[PDB]
Design a protein around this ligand. Sequence first.
Ligand SMILES: c1ccc(COc2ccc3[nH]ccc3c2)cc1
Length: 204
Amino acid sequence: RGLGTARLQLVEFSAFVEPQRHLFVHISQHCPSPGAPPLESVDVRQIYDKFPEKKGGLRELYDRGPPHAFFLVKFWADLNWGGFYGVSSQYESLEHMTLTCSSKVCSFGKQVVEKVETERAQLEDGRFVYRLLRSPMCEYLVNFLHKLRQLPERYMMNSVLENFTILQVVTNRDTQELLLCTAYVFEVSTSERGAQHHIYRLVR
Ligand SMILES: c1ccc(COc2ccc3[nH]ccc3c2)cc1
């Protein structure tokens, strides 16, 4: 499938730096069409420890449901490049909604940043689109990225990134319904191979 539900679909996601653009990670679901197949599944239990077991932790979130709203993205990021560091997200749906978008940056399973944004639906092409464009990337991530690009060896970046995760929770602001919950894990790619990603379903 893709990263989305009947109610809300991710359309594009990127994290980038501008002085053109450099993209650290990118999901295009404009992609688009598959030809096949469905998404592989990963047992959400094997990643409880990469996020806080406190309130709003993975286990708590998944317990309430709905379980089909839960995805894991593995990113191989491109760190070969002080400009403007940005994140851009676009969702779409057929219903009119206001979204609450929470991003939780985690280091060794502890939250070091929570970022909460709100985005109202916008009618376009007979569907509703939710554009969170050019949101300044938090300072901790900028500083982290500047240190990460210093490491002399890709495998050392990977070692450092094995304890770094992001949890993104999109809820219907009005109703409090969870719409999408995405866990992100990270390695690095080469400049030659370019950034890449793999989306899974989280199951239990
Ligand atoms: C390591 C590699 C790439 C990057 C790109 O920076 C971001 C920033 C916000 C994000 N939200 C979901 C993935 C994501 C990525 C950060 C750290």
